Ligand binder design. Sequence first.
Ligand SMILES: CC(C)N(Cc1ccccc1OCCCCCC(=O)O)C(=O)c1ccc(-c2ccsc2)cc1
Ligand SMILES: CCCCCCCO[C@@H]1O[C@H](CO)[C@@H](O)[C@H](O)[C@H]1O
Length: 271
Amino acid sequence: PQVADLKAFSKHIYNAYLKNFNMTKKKARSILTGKASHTAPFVIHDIETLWQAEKGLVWKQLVNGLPPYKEISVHVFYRCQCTTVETVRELTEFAKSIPSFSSLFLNDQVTLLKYGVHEAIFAMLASIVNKDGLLVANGSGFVTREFLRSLRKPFSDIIEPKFEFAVKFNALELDDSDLALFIAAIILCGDRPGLMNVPRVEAIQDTILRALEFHLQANHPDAQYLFPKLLQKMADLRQLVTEHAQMMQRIKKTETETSLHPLLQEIYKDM
Ligand SMILES: CC(C)N(Cc1ccccc1OCCCCCC(=O)O)C(=O)c1ccc(-c2ccsc2)cc1
Ligand SMILES: CCCCCCCO[C@@H]1O[C@H](CO)[C@@H](O)[C@H](O)[C@H]1O
């Protein structure tokens, strides 16, 4: 019974994922691996190609509406911020499409998103990343890791750790059906500070985790220790976000000309 019930639950979360996220890992890898297609991403690897891309690629956030221009490294950071906020919106709609998340009182929904979205973002980031760079502009561009490394501190430093995580995470070869459960588990997390109904979120979390371990025995029958490995990645993501927040505190302190989106301010407010 348990195995069957959890299979149904996993399908419902997968559908939530497919309904709400702009890009799947399946579509991202097909673009990254240069699979047969009539278009390839424009490669952004330096100042000239960045400029060409702001001229020639289609961006969800129009450039005129980014904060006023400061310099190349900051401009890149503003593009990072734009896409981060866009992903928070997707994650919010994904979570809302899970009935046991929507049943929670709205204040607990906010607390879970507040403390979970960055972990979920850096996990789902891996889907559009390879060792050489990442997709941007809905897959119409590819920004090289080497170019991101070339930006001045503090902006290069806040980027490279996410590549290090992503390449290791991609070696586990999760697909979108795995990620739907993994991200649902990240968000529905009973450990978040200030939660009102902890036992309820703990129970949901546990249900998602049992669903996940069964999902992996079916979908990845030959992959030994894959479930405990993913529990460790959940732990790892907390540390990655702790780091990230500390780096953001330093950008707020030392980069006073750099504009920080007010939603992200509300997220770091307490951390
Ligand atoms: C949401 C993900 C995570 N990112 C950002 C990102 C990726 C990898 C490492 C770090 C990143 O952002 C750290 C700062 C985040 C500040 C917002 C905040 O306070 O969280 C991106 O999708 C992204 C988007 C656009 C570009 C780009 C465009 C033109 S040239 C480069 C590069 C990356
Ligand atoms: C869209 C989901 C993402 C939500 C982002 C984080 C929300 O921040 C928090 O919102 C609360 C009001 O609801 C305040 O009481 C907190 O002080 C503030 O930190």
